[PDB]
Design a protein around this ligand. Sequence first.
Ligand SMILES: *[C@@H](C)c1ccccc1
Lengths: 59, 10
Amino acid sequence: SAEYVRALFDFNGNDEEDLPFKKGDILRIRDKPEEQWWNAEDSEGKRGMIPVPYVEKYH
Amino acid sequence: EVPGPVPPRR
Ligand SMILES: *[C@@H](C)c1ccccc1
């Protein structure tokens, strides 16, 4: 019962802690320290922060 | 900038 999101826009990543991704990517949600910034993990296991408005709740 | 700006951090 993992929580995923689908990237709506390409995010190159602004900060070193940010998780860069591309439009259509599936990311697993690990943490929610903020309303608009969540800690996610991509398909390859790389972790980092992502902007919520750039993704949609998968399923 | 096709997407809107990223949200404010903290
Ligand atoms: C970028 C996230 C965007 C685009 C249109 C309206 C609001 C935000």
